[PDB]
Design a protein around this ligand. Structure first.
Ligand SMILES: *[C@@H]1O[C@H](CO)[C@@H](O[C@@H]2O[C@H](CO)[C@@H](O[C@@H]3O[C@H](CO)[C@@H](O)[C@H](O)[C@@H]3O)[C@H](O)[C@H]2NC(C)=O)[C@H](O)[C@H]1NC(C)=O
Ligand SMILES: *[C@@H]1O[C@H](CO)[C@@H](O)[C@H](O)[C@H]1NC(C)=O
Ligand SMILES: *[C@@H]1O[C@H](CO)[C@@H](O)[C@H](O)[C@H]1NC(C)=O
Lengths: 48, 285, 283
């Protein structure tokens, strides 16, 4: 239960982006504002 | 018309421990079968409050600090506290908000009002109807005006016990004043009943004033105006951590403050009411 | 992955692209502490008319934030700043405009539209009659107006002008024609983002299919079907035991729905060997 929920709650970590949501960073921000913070949340979630 | 009274006394300052007050729905999220931990601007449990026994010569509404938000309670028999001036200077010098319930509508405006030195409802005492909103005389450089949908409230002087308990929470955010409403029937002799009661969202109010003080507009009662019996409080919203137990219908059924005592700081770590016997690591000092 | 089939666009009742003279047509803009409020409600707006005018020259949104619109009322805020105070019209960012004159909300964020008024709203002695707050006993919260036409007490004590060592709350900008761009008066419309919706149409509830969906405050792909969840009337949508939304009250017809994601998973291949055969069966 813990190792799934710790894997769950680290979805919601910002990792230095303006949010932990890849589709807000996709849609709401600029395309230069996107790829800066897309590349943050992947490298965060990948090694999580 | 800016008029005064014959006598304005100080309340009885009767102390009370607010047990389970201040709870509301923060969000619009439905959740069920769950147990959710959050901070928001909450009234804390077991909070020492003071009883503002307004009785027939006592009239407590000076400049009262708001600063982020306040909790309000009122056991009511005569339905006295029905208005609130919000603002900073409490004079005709800065932009203020007069929220009144004038027994027909909720009238809310955001202006630089000609604020009187006495915020009251000029209401005839043996029958309970308002002659004039003697809080402002007129208004200047407004930003907002609204009248709610119509109903009626009996606001004459009543005797016996308090039959009406209204729960109010006011907060400044993004221009939007959020005013939330709670209610239960009561049968109340003294300061406050213990028990649990939530609040629900009613108002989203882009008022745009610097909200740093409040003067809770009371109701004046005289057939030279007076008042009558009303027990109402002032509480303060603090950034404290709450548990939010949701039942199967999504009603908040109970809540636990984390910052009361080491028993309830443990509950927020376990995320339960049930805690087994032993020792549990909690956060560092 | 199952590739979806259908669009679900559900909203309350639809109006057209309304003209907004408060966006691009106003000629004189007042002070910033007493910033003029005009609002936008119940119109499917793009605010392309911010660009489409001969009254403005900057065209920047705080500009992909132009389409940041499926929420409550937008407030087209009219005021003239200086070039050194163009920078402070921001969500937060507490300078002399944001901390005391005009603070911006931060759920969504609109567009700040300035215009070169060197020849109309300025003079060579400084058009000082436009003013701004620089120091006040109390900070603004977001989306507030300050109409205190009052001689100010700089520390909370009874020191009001015209007494000695008692300050005014208003400095002069310095709207000079003889200076550069940093001291010019700039007519600024700000769309304060705090009911309009940009991508607002109405399509069909394509139920029981892997679809796309766009709702009042809810986007995504998945499977749609009615739900039985006891929504409160003040509750828009539901979430699961995790933290993504799986239930929604319909923006158009208030039918309580479920949102399951689309089906997906892994693939195996069951083969008996190339020496054995050349047929496979997949799982
Ligand atoms: C969530 O709210 C719903 C109401 O929308 C609750 O459902 C209703 O609950 C009451 C009380 O348990 C049920 O009444 C009972 O009826 C039986 C059948 O005759 C009777 O023997 C009992 O003495 C009682 O009166 C009512 O039937 C039920 N509604 C339906 C449609 O079944 C529900 O209980 C709430 N959730 C929770 C967790 O309480
Ligand atoms: C609450 O504060 C008041 C201060 O006026 C004090 O007299 C009272 O004893 C306090 N309540 C408790 C339960 O200590
Ligand atoms: C394929 O399987 C048969 C089974 O007896 C074996 O004799 C043969 O050597 C296999 N083929 C190769 C290339 O090894």
């Amino acid at each position: 239960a813990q190792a799934l929920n710790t894997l769950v709650k680290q979805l919601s970590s910002n990792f230095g982006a303006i949010s932990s949501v890849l589709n807000d960073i996709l849609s709401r921000l600029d395309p230069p504002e996107a790829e800066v913070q897309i590349d943050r949340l992947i490298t965060g979630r990948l090694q999580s | 018309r800016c008029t005064t009274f014959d006598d304005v006394q100080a309340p009885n300052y009767t102390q009370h421990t607010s047990s389970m007050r201040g709870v509301y729905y923060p969000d619009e999220i439905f959740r069920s079968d769950t147990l959710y931990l959050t901070q928001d601007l909450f009234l804390p449990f077991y909070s020492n409050v003071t009883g503002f026994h307004t009785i027939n010569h006592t009239f407590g509404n000076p400049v009262i600090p708001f600063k982020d938000g306040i909790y309000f309670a009122a056991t009511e028999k005569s339905n006295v506290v029905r208005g609130w001036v919000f603002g900073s200077t409490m004079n005709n010098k800065s932009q203020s908000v007069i929220i009144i319930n004038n027994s027909t509508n909720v009238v809310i405006r955001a202006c630089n009002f000609e604020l009187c030195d006495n915020p009251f409802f000029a209401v005839s005492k043996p029958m309970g109807t308002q002659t004039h909103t003697m809080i402002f005389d007129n208004a200047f450089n407004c930003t907002f005006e609204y009248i709610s949908d119509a109903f009626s409230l009996d606001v004459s002087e009543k005797s016996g016990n308090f039959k009406h308990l209204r729960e109010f929470v006011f907060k400044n955010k993004d221009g939007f004043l959020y005013v939330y409403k709670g209610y239960q029937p009561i049968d109340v002799v003294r300061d406050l009943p213990s028990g649990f009661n939530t609040l629900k969202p009613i108002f989203k109010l882009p008022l745009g004033i610097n909200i740093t003080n409040f003067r809770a507009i009371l109701t004046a009662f005289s057939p030279i105006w007076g008042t009558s019996a009303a027990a109402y409080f002032v509480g303060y919203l603090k950034p404290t951590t709450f548990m939010l137990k949701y039942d199967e219908n999504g009603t908040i059924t109970d809540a636990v403050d984390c910052s009361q005592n080491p028993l309830a700081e443990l509950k927020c770590s376990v995320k339960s009411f049930e805690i087994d016997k032993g020792i549990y690591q909690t956060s560092n000092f | 992955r199952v590739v979806p089939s259908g669009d679900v666009v559900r909203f309350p009742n639809i109006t057209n692209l309304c003209p907004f003279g408060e966006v691009f047509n106003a000629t004189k803009f007042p002070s910033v502490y007493a910033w003029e409020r005009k609002k936008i409600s119940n119109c499917v707006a793009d605010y392309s008319v911010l660009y489409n005018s001969t009254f403005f020259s900057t065209f920047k949104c705080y500009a992909t934030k132009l389409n940041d619109l499926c929420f409550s009322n937008v407030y087209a805020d009219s005021f003239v700043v200086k070039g050194d105070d163009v920078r402070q019209i921001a969500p937060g960012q507490t300078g002399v405009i944001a901390d005391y004159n005009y603070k911006l909300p931060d759920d969504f964020m609109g567009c700040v539209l300035a215009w070169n008024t060197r020849n109309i709203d300025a003079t060579s002695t400084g058009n000082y009659n436009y003013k701004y707050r620089y120091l006040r006993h109390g900070k603004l919260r977001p989306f507030e107006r300050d109409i205190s036409n009052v001689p100010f007490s700089p520390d909370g004590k009874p020191c009001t002008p015209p007494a000695l060592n008692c300050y005014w709350p208003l400095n002069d900008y310095g709207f000079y024609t003889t200076t550069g761009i940093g001291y010019q008066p700039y007519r600024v419309v700000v769309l304060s983002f705090e009911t309009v919706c940009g991508p607002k149409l109405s399509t069909d509830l394509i139920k029981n299919q892997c679809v796309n969906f766009n709702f009042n405050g809810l986007t995504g792909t998945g499977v749609l079907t009615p739900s039985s969840k006891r929504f409160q009337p003040f509750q828009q949508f539901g979430r699961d035991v995790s933290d993504f939304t799986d239930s929604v009250r319909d923006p158009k017809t208030s039918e309580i729905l479920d949102i399951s994601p689309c089906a997906f998973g892994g693939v195996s291949v069951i083969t008996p060997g190339t020496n054995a055969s050349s047929e496979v069966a997949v799982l």
